Design a binder for this molecule. Structure first.
Ligand SMILES: [As]
Lengths: 310, 310, 310, 310, 310
């Protein structure tokens, strides 16, 4: 029984994030528990303040006509309990629910450990024989507590795109709003636990530039190459199959090279020291001790620049 | 209370993919959230536009008779909320729901990292005492947004087989339609993370063709063979037990060989260099340095051709 | 309101597997989505074909009395939507639902990678003041599509034990039926990925029978022993804690020995070659080169026979 | 509308375990699916057998007053469907539901691999203005099938403490019963997969008591110490953070020592063989070959005794 | 239909923890099952003890007006069954439910293995046209059994902040209470399983201060460094991405250093012993044997003090 109008009826929205959690980088989802605040004029139930009852009248959902506000990017039906409904005299309705649903917004792992994100929540609404435009009421959208969690993410700002996007979808127009959740990652625990350890093994790797024993140079460059897989694999696991290239996947891969040419040297410092030409060998080995850490720290300035600096 | 007809009543279908996600290579499933668009003439509730009400009359599901459209290949009951029902004058019904269910379509991992897929959604409908034929209405089947996600897959085309398949199933005929979702994989993250690293270790493996120390040749060929298991195991994990042979399972296995004959050589370059016949040894070792990388790159053109080229 | 009878009322059952999936070796469960087909004579609602309406009358569940058919070996309440109910003239009822529940049937991993299974679905029904006997109607039990999936398993046959098992359970007799799903595993991906790789490392292991360097023989036999744990652990993970012995757990363990005595040899080929008695040493080493691969392939014929051949 | 009585009304309980499963050592829970059997005299609905109807009258739950029997140690609300209600003439009610809930009973991992357990299910009931005492009816408590599963546990006995525990809880007395599920673990798969492999590596560890090469003794004692972590870590994972000491955590830890002093020896057999005093060295090494396996098998008799024998 | 009052109506709260469990360090949640005890004067249904019925009258929830008490920090809607409602003569209501919900309270891993925690449960209540103030009744808040579990945590005290926090939230004041659950961790299983094993490997690490073989010193210091990752990774897994530094993450990282300088020494004890200057080498090696374990145990007093002592 929709509110007989003279034009496209505006429904006024708003979301108060109460709880945020389980951001799942693999799945590219995250769970939210918030308030949903709808309101619209349904003159059809305006009500003579003095003549009867009081300032505002309380209805159960079954009584009033309520707009079907579906969330767009959600796994399942949003999971909402109704908090209160309050019809003002002029026929204005005040709806408030408290839903909790897991939201499917994409993430950009291009700078992985040092990435900032922008999550979305949507809200469409399909029309009947009066059109429905949704729009935001920013006093109910200051949604976000001073307790909004989201482990391992700094939360920057919950805003929303005031202007809705009105489509035609199957001979019935819908109206979609964009609620924006901006977050930066807490890179850090990525250092003592990934970056640093990763580097350390790389350095030991090429301690075999001050060594002559092939036996203890393969026992050296090869042992460390293994541990790098232990890190490549550790990192690769908590991260989805991007069709593009990650920052850490870059360096984690660039690293794979400095182990190949590392193993190339140790190898050549021998077919060239069993060829009785140690003239050359400890000339090369001697060089490597510079070329490598340089080319590296060089290729990291090259690489790091390539991602953040551009 | 089904619509009294003069022949098999046609129900007109359509699916607008809203969200796509969690394609699960192991489970051979994927989750979809879409619009379901049904429509049929139920002359039984045609309604004198002028004489009463308006252009089109809105019903709740309980009022009208609605056709039971079950999805065929689904784990559980499809999970739908109803968006709107609109009976036209002539007795034509306009049904629209917005379901979300996880769909069990098979995948062909024969070219694994470089595979294209064709997912299916089904929709049967069993008949009563008027026969039901389903068929597609292509304005509600343009289903698929410009936002359809499906991480790590390029989505090519959502179409549908116009001609339904009508069975006899238990003394009651059913009608099944075929909705087709064609996707190609985003192979790539498979290179810096699998293929390349995998190859690199293989090359280091046979750096022991320019070495004479058995000690550092086993510390060499054997250490790399381990890391290959680290990749065989990593790859074997995100991939089901195909009764056939994968492409990467091919080369990942072909590889296992170039480590066995590699370890064969290093081994023989010694029972033949402690047999005071280094005449032969460094004749073999010398050859291996070619035979191997050739036979390999040869067997990869042979293998690769065997899969893609045929 | 149960159908007043003159004897134990027979309810006629049937299950059409529509979808099969998520067989979970660890959990010993599997999920099924099928048709449930019940039927019984309730003369109490026979209905004068000519005198009124038509050939058959359609009821909602609330109207008719329907038998409580519970599935026995199920995690939770079976998850069924009703497809149609059709009372024939003589008072015969035609019930059809389409449930989906996850089923707890045990598996026998005794031949693990090469095992065939026999899954069960149950269906009890408890009685009131007329006894209920269930029994199968084999036209609704041809249940199983030509699309029944079950990844990594060949499906052999869906049948059912016609004769029900009628118990006394708490001063009320119940009647249970046995629906049988027979499957063989798709052993194979177990070869290029487990068996073969496992063997290869074992062979390299005992390449140290043609070597004299203890340094490169422990670097040899020990490195491979590690990789075998990487396989024991890989295999042990996707497999429950059987109180009995698995086939692959056999050979995977038999293998642990050929590494212990392998490491015994290399070890003794030294306290007996530093004891200036290489007379003996390269007599033993020389032998091992046969004893081992023989005793092995021997113990595998012994072992394999012990499991399959008996 | 509770049954007007002359004293504390006894409600008669009973539980028929139908299914048992998912015992979760980490979570200290387990799932059960059983019958709940309640019964009480509500003279208020006694009913003249001859005068009307029949022997016993069937009610829906809404009609009768039923006692709120909550399970105490449960994660969520118990998940029950009602099987039948049958009021006898004298006003006696026969209630039967078939719930399934996951139960939070603690476990004692003190003897871990060789531990027996005693699970609990509770059932309280709070009173109104007639007191409620619960008590057991042992014909409906023989609950437990001949099919009760519980993977990896031998089920010994389902009994119940006849005398209830009646508290005062918030100015209203409750009555709690204790249903006892006694199980022993199927230790075994813990031997070929943990205990044995664990020991084997320990033995190889100290094969370096018959060796003199420090290079191949560290390559020896150290490589095995790693693999022990692979087992410490494997075992530690499927086991919660006990504030006390596990048996296997004992020996798994005692083991850590025999690798420290093992590495101590190999180390000292060298700063004492490069000190040109091999007089002593191969005197120690010689001793270790006994002290170790003895002190070990000794400390295991000491340790094992300490846990089981006391 | 809220209770017509003369001022802000006080609702009297209380929570009897019945069950506690699944504290999830990664998720920063925990599950609780307790009694919720509300009470308020609704003079509107006072009732002439003598004139009618009895001492107290029992209502179903639908009859009375009940206050909407939502829990604040909860994932989903709290999951409550109602235990009893009892209106006293004066119009006093006695409400009692038994909810079970999972609670999102944050934890401070700053002292990780040796940390004490303070969990929160909240309870807001929004007002209508009489204000609602909640407040605690400490006879229904002694909530907590003598059976409160919470595996791997010692439970210290369940109390509550008597003075509520009254906000203005969207032109309607709410009232929030703070229920406090204080727990200390059962550090311990962290020693035989983490701390000790971790240390042991560190000690073996630097057994290469009494060794001269580079081959057996890298096979030494490097093998142990790996095992440390096996522990860093084991520990890092059951612990969230703190933006701050953990205690064990400190020492687990401080440790990474004593392996780098350890490997630095062994390395330098060689480019300085192949430089025919063993004068210096076995002067350094000799020193390390002290500097290390000291600087360590020193840096641990330094470190441990830095966390607990301040
Ligand atoms: As190694």
């Amino acid at each position: 029984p929709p509110p007989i109008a003279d034009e496209p009826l505006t429904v006024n929205t708003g979301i108060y994030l109460i709880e945020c959690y389980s951001l799942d980088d693999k799945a590219e989802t995250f769970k939210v528990n918030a308030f949903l605040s709808l309101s619209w004029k349904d003159r059809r139930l305006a009500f003579d303040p003095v003549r009867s009852g009081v300032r505002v009248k309380t209805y159960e959902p079954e009584a009033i006509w309520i707009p079907e506000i579906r969330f767009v990017n959600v796994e399942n039906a949003r999971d909402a309990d109704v908090v209160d409904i309050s019809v003002s005299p002029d026929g204005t309705v005040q709806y408030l629910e408290r839903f909790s649903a897991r939201v499917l917004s994409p993430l950009d792992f291009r700078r992985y450990p040092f990435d900032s994100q922008t999550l979305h929540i949507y809200l469409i609404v399909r029309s009947v024989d009066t059109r429905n435009i949704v729009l935001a009421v920013d006093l109910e959208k200051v949604g976000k507590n001073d307790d909004v969690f989201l482990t391992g993410w700094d939360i920057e700002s919950f805003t929303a795109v005031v202007k809705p996007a009105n489509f035609a979808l199957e001979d019935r127009l819908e109206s979609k709003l964009d609620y924006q959740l901006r977050i930066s990652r807490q890179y850090f625990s990525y250092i003592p636990n990934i970056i640093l350890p990763m580097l350390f093994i790389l350095f030991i790797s090429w301690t075999a530039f001050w060594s002559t024993s092939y036996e203890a140079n393969v026992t050296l460059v090869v042992s460390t190459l293994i541990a790098h897989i232990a890190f490549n694999i550790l990192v690769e696991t908590n991260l989805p199959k991007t069709p593009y290239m990650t920052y850490t996947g870059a360096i984690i891969f660039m690293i794979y090279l400095f182990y190949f040419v590392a193993v190339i040297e140790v190898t050549v410092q021998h077919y060239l020291k069993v060829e009785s030409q140690p003239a050359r060998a400890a000339s090369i080995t001697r060089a490597s001790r510079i070329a490598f850490p340089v080319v590296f720290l060089l290729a990291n300035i090259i690489l790091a620049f390539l991602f953040f600096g551009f």
